[PDB]
Amino acid sequence: GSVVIVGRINLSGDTAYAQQTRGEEGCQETSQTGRDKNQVEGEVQIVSTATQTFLATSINGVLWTVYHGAGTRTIASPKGPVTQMYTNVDKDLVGWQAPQGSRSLTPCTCGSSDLYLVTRHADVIPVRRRGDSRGSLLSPRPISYLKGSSGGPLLCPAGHAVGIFKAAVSTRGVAKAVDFIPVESLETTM
Ligand SMILES: C=C[C@@H]1C[C@]1(NC(=O)[C@@H]1C[C@@H]2CN1C(=O)[C@H](C(C)(C)C)NC(=O)O[C@@H]1C[C@H]1CCCCCc1nc3ccc(OC)cc3nc1O2)C(=O)NS(=O)(=O)C1CC1
Ligand SMILES: [Zn+2]
């Protein structure tokens, strides 16, 4: 089946909050036809397959998500199923053409290390960048807490995308740092 947009994380105001936009059955029909009529809004999409839900982030005109969530799937669209433009397993990276109506996050140009991770729950966690592709969490959470939030953006203090969340570095089933796909890697791909 196709990957279907089931919602969006809202950043366009003070609060971050997920608006779910489609039902399970609606998701199933639209996964199956690959034709999606629903309007697209914002930067961070909530996407799901038949069995998993995760996030998808628009950066430089391309909707980015994790390969471990989307596999090789097409995305359901107004004109039908769309094959991936970008698919890189080593990087765990896949991209489609950003859907009509979506907005891109501007890439971070500030070199700021006080980062922020937007989860599926629309919580905004401070992350402290610790490397070329790693940020430690100020407050550590259980791995369950972050699960389902891959493909989501890591933001600088100016609201710009720094990377895409990919994997959680876990000790005793507690995430203490997050592994991301820095924008610079997306541009290498593009
Ligand atoms: C808990 C939040 C976390 C963000 C989430 N990511 C994962 O769970 C990833 C997927 C998988 C394991 N992940 C992990 O995070 C593990 C885990 C033990 C699960 C905590 N952590 C981990 O390895 O830490 C090690 C230091 C890093 C080493 C680097 C890891 C490599 C990353 C990775 N790459 C590829 C490339 C290609 C593949 O093809 C099939 C598959 C891959 N799988 C991968 O890891 C998430 O929420 N997902 S999700 O939304 O529920 C799902 C629907 C989409
Ligand atoms: Zn910045």
Numbering used by the authors: 990 to 1179
Publication text:
Relative to the wild type, R155K caused large reductions in potency for danoprevir and vaniprevir, but MK-5172 remained highly active (R155K IC50 = 0.55 nM). Unlike in the danoprevir and vaniprevir complexes with wild type, in the MK-5172-wild-type complex the P2 quinoxaline moiety did not stack on R155 and interacted less with D168 and the electrostatic network involving these residues. Thus, the single-site mutations R155K and D168A only caused very subtle changes in the MK-5172 binding conformations. This subtle effect is reflected in the small loss of potency against the R155K variant; however, MK-5172 exhibited 100-fold lower potency against the D168A variant, likely due to less extensive interactions with D81 and K136 relative to wild-type and R155K. Overall, analysis of the four crystal structures explains MK-5172's significantly retained potency against R155K and D168A as well as its loss of potency against the A156T variant due to the rigidity of the macrocycle. The P2 quinoxaline moiety of MK-5172 stacks against the protease catalytic triad in a novel conformation, explaining its retained potency against R155K and D168A. Unlike other inhibitors, MK5172 does not directly interact with R155 and D168, which mutate to confer multi-drug resistance. This unique binding mode of MK-5172 explains its significantly greater potency against R155K and D168A variants compared to other inhibitors.
